[PDB]
Each structure stands twice: as C-alpha cells, then as structure tokens.
Structure 1
Amino acid sequence: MRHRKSGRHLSRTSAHRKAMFQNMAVSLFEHELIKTTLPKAKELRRVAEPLITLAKEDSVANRRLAFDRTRSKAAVGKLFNDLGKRYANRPGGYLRILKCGFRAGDNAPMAYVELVDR
C-alpha cells in the first residue's frame, strides 16, 4: 500500500541489493564519474554521502567503521586522505545527478553521478 514508506526494491533480493550499492560506491571513489541508470542513481545518493560525512573525522574506530561497509583497502585509502579534506567546509550535498538520454538497447533513462568539486 506503501503509505509513507521509503526505499525501493529494484527487483533484486535483499542481499544482492546490499552488495550492489556497496560495489557502485567503491567504483565511484576511483573514477569520480559513473554512467549509470536513473533509478539506481536516486538510491546511490543515500549510501555514498554517509561515507563522505564519516570521512571528516579520522579515527581507528572510524577507519574500521568505514572498512566494514565499503569493504576495500583502496576505497578506505582514497577516503581519509583526499576526500573528507577536499570537502572540509561544505555542509551536505556532495554529488550531483544529470539526466542524459536513453539506453540504445532498452529505453532505460541514464544519469551521471559526479562529485561536486573536481
């Protein structure tokens, strides 16, 4: 019935969906621009920004909390050293979404995700 409920399913099971947004974030903090699908970008912006907010405070407990949800050495190394310092004085709103055409094969509307200062 969906009244005042939040979060969308994307026709995947709950363990796929957890392990896919963990994998779209870990590729966004390597290349800083991803050509992805439009409903998958509206829900990437509720996973990525709690990693950038977390990166503004260096700690052994924060570098373990960061590693336990984007599990990679290179993404934790890319945070806490470059990001969380470049974005040191911007309150919220760390990345933007620009709609761009449609897919050739289907009609899946596309979007870019791009970090805001680059």
Structure 2
Amino acid sequence: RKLGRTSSQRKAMLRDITTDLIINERIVTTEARAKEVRSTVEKMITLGKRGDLHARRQAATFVRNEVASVREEDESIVVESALQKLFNDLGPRFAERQGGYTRILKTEPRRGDAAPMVVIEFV
C-alpha cells in the first residue's frame, strides 16, 4: 500500500474520492491516489453485484453518507443518493464484464508542483 498521511486521514480521503467517480464516472487527480482509488472502487462494485441486505449494509460504510444525484423528473423530484445509484445503475451494467473496470490515462503535470496528473474512467 501507499500511505499519504496518518491512518484515519487516508481512510477519509479514499472514502471521499471513491464517492465522486461514482457520481461523475470521471475524475482528474494525481498518480498515486489514482492507483489506490482504482483498487478501492473496483472492490466496492462487486458489492453492487449481490444486491441483498448484507451487501447493502456492508457497502453503506464506504460511501459518503448522502450526496444527491438528480437528473430525473416525470412529475416529481426523484432523488438518488449515490448509493442507490450504485445498486440501481452501475450494478446491472456490469453483469457480464468480470473484474477490472477502470481506465487510467497519464496526461500532463501541473503548474505549481509538477505532480503528473491522470484521469479515471469506467468502461
């Protein structure tokens, strides 16, 4: 593994990054956080493939509690809390694809620190 800070700070940083990239399917950050987050995200999508209680109540600790995602209305305001998304949209979208569902792209360093940045996608 790769530490960046103390323990609990790293845990919170990952529980942050993998909650985006659930909502946007794309993210532009550095190189190391990329590798650790691809591991974590792929490990938190197999839980989207069981869909029962126990997988629900185990996934429900590695996701920022409530982060709305609303692009829908029929005559209503439907709200999707970025976990319900995990169990409603990403899940049924990977049934036949087995492990390994993220792409990492090495783009270009940054202005102030020359930290070689990177992208992350899903298909």
TM range, smaller chain: 0.7 to 0.9
User: What amino acid is aligned across from residue 108 of structure 1 in structure 2?
Assistant: A
Task: Give, as a single letter, the amino acid of the residue that structure 2 aligns with 1:113.
Answer: I
- What is residue 22 of structure 1 aligned with on the other side? 15
RMSD of aligned alpha carbons: 1.0
Q: Deviations over 1:17-58 (max 9, x none)?
A: 001001000111111110010111011112111111111111
In the other structure, the counterpart of 1:88 is 95
CA distance in structure 2 between the aligned counterparts of 1:69 and 1:27, rounded to whole angstroms: 12
Distance in 1 separating the partners of 2:51 and 2:2: 32
1:58 paired to 2:65: no
1:71 shift after superposition: 3.8
Corresponding pairs, count: 109
State TM-score, norm by structure 1.
Answer: 0.88
3-state DSSP of counterpart to 2:120: strand
Instruction: Provide the C-alpha distance between the structure 1 equivalents of 2:43 and 2:35, rounded to a whole number of angstroms.
Output: 15
- Once the two structures are superposed, what CA deviation does each residue of 1:62-102 show, in whole Å capped at 9, x if it has no partner? 11111022142422111110011111111111111000111
Cα separation, 2, equivalents of 1:39 and 1:102: 13
The aligned runs of 1:1-118 (5 Å cut-off) are: 7-10=1-4, 12-73=5-66, 74-116=81-123
Give 1:4's aligned residue: none
Structure 2, gaps ≥5 residues long: 67-80
Percent of pairs identical after alignment? Answer: 47
Runs (4+) of structure 1 exceeding 3 A deviation are none
Distance of 1:75 and 1:108 partners within structure 2 = 30
Counterpart CA distance in 2 for 1:14 and 1:23 is: 14
Question: Using the alignment, how far apart are the partners of 2:51 and 2:32 within structure 1?
Answer: 32
